[PDB]
Amino acid sequence: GAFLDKPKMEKHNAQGQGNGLRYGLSSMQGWRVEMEDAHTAVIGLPSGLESWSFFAVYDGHAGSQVAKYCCEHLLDHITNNQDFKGSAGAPSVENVKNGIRTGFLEIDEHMRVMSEKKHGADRSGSTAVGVLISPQHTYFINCGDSRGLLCRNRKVHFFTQDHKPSNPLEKERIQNAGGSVMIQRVNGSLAVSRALGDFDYKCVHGKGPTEQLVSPEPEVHDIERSEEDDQFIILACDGIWDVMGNEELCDFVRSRLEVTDDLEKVCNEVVDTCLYKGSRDNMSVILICFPNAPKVSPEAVKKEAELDKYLECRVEEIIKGVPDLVHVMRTLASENIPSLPPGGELASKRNVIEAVYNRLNPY
Ligand SMILES: [Mn+2]
Ligand SMILES: [Mn+2]
């Protein structure tokens, strides 16, 4: 219902290493009155899945309860059911895929009984996007309009398709559940067609759990791993993707990775860049890097130092009636400066531009 007067730009980070993987993450509240995003990041899983990893972003709505419960418990609902455990030995593709389906459906109903028993007041819901990573497979998991992508061989190899109510099959389901899609929203309100929680949207008599107005059913894709070609995976809520496309963000992260191996920092830059491109939502990014992720380049670091220094001289020159930061950014944009980070553009350089402005106009 409301925005803050000024954005909360404080970063919450995590990082880790194991099973040949490196990860960083960054979350920021931004312009929104609340922080309703959640996440999971775990390298090495219980019960003989030490060599497996799991990462996920949760974009909560109408509260954070559903998202928070998911970020702590979705993983064991997924792995601790009979479908995931099916066959005697290691789980098959089908096992893993049905395991995730069941995990999603069972946690949703689990939360529903919990809320029904304790007379819960919140009507919250949550998207989930994530990857379950085995020695030989990346399993992409999507439920809602959060998004994940795989960069392989300097390119977008795969990305998750957002569940929007106006998508043909989502629309079909919603209409069979006796609702409608008005513009982009389920009955004029909800901007997602798939999510955990939203129990008010799951009350149609004579319709299965996956045939309600809002569905908890996940979409899973098996991608065979490529030791040689797999570079990195990005997972993020719509707050990021609203203001950057797949190619852009993929290129941007690449440009950043060529400057630092610090992944929390790369994730920070994504979130800030997105804030400065005009995103007014909560923002959460997870970055998972494979052994052949882009490496720090001596030249790229130098190019960045030269750009940084150049940007600082430009700021000094511009302040000669003493223009404000907004007007300095305007001038710099109209200068069509070359060699700005791909995807990030000027926005990705605002922290550098602003630090300078503050050194020269600290009042
Ligand atoms: Mn949200
Ligand atoms: Mn959001």
Question: Can you walk me through this structure?
Answer:
The PDB classes it as hydrolase. Keywords: phosphatase, Alternative splicing, Hydrolase, Magnesium, Manganese, Metal-binding, Phosphoprotein, Protein phosphatase. The assembly is monomeric. Crystal Structure of Human Protein phosphatase 1A (PPM1A) Bound with Phosphate at 1 mM of Mn2+. The protein: Protein phosphatase 1A. The organism is Homo sapiens. The chain is α+β, with helices and mostly antiparallel strands and 363 residues long. The protein folds into two domains: 1-294, Phosphatase 2c, domain 1 (4-Layer Sandwich); 295-363, Phosphatase 2C, C-terminal domain suprefamily (Arc Repressor Mutant, subunit A), CATH 1.10.10.430. Helix content is 34%, strand content 27%. The protein has ten helices and 17 strands. It has helices at residues 65-79, 82-85, 93-117, 168-176, 238-241, 246-257, 263-276, 298-318, 325-334, 350-360, and strands at 3-8, 12-18, 21-28, 30-32, 37-45, 49-61, 125-126, 128-133, 137-143, 147-152, 155-159, 181-182, 185-186, 196-197, 219-224, 230-236, 283-289. The strands form four sheets. Strands 5, 6, 7, 8, 9, 14 and 15 form a seven-stranded antiparallel beta sheet that branches. The chain has a six-stranded antiparallel beta sheet with strand order 2-3-17-16-10-11. A hairpin with a 3-residue loop joins strand 5 (37-45) and strand 6. Helix 6 (246-257) crosses helix 7 (263-276). The two termini are 33 Å apart. The relative contact order is 0.14.
